[PDB]
Design a protein around this ligand. Structure first.
Ligand SMILES: CC(=O)N[C@@H]1[C@@H](O)[C@H](O[C@@H]2O[C@H](CO)[C@@H](O[C@@H]3O[C@H](CO)[C@@H](O)[C@H](O)[C@H]3NC(C)=O)[C@H](O)[C@H]2NC(C)=O)[C@@H](CO)O[C@H]1O
Length: 82
């Protein structure tokens, strides 16, 4: 049964996860993409997003995306770079 969204009385997902248009929590494009009901910016971080820190100990790249690659953790990384 739905764990978030309108069929869950506006309930939000834990750890900032995206609530899909179908009412479930997750982090792939099916959850965070078009139709996403809430917390759709799970993968964004840094200066352009209220200085939010990434979950899962991910680095916040200079472009404001969360990840583990050298591109997200090296050169311009905003937080949790190591
Ligand atoms: C304005 C512009 O195009 N700027 C470029 C930056 O966007 C780009 O950073 C990378 O952007 C892509 C999306 O366009 C990021 O992919 C996302 O990564 C998350 C999790 O890491 C994943 O859930 C998304 O599905 C995925 N989207 C796609 C479309 O694959 C990618 O992580 C960003 N990389 C970094 C290091 O922040 C940078 C680097 O290529 O270049 C700018 O010109």
């Amino acid at each position: 049964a739905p764990e978030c969204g309108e069929r869950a009385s506006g309930k939000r997902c834990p750890n900032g996860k995206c609530c899909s248009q179908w009412g479930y929590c997750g982090t792939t494009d099916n959850y965070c993409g078009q139709g996403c009901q809430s917390q759709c910016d799970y993968w964004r971080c840094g200066r352009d997003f209220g200085g939010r820190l990434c979950e899962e100990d991910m680095c916040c790249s200079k472009y404001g995306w969360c990840g583990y690659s050298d591109d997200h953790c090296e050169d311009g990384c905003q937080s949790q770079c190591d």
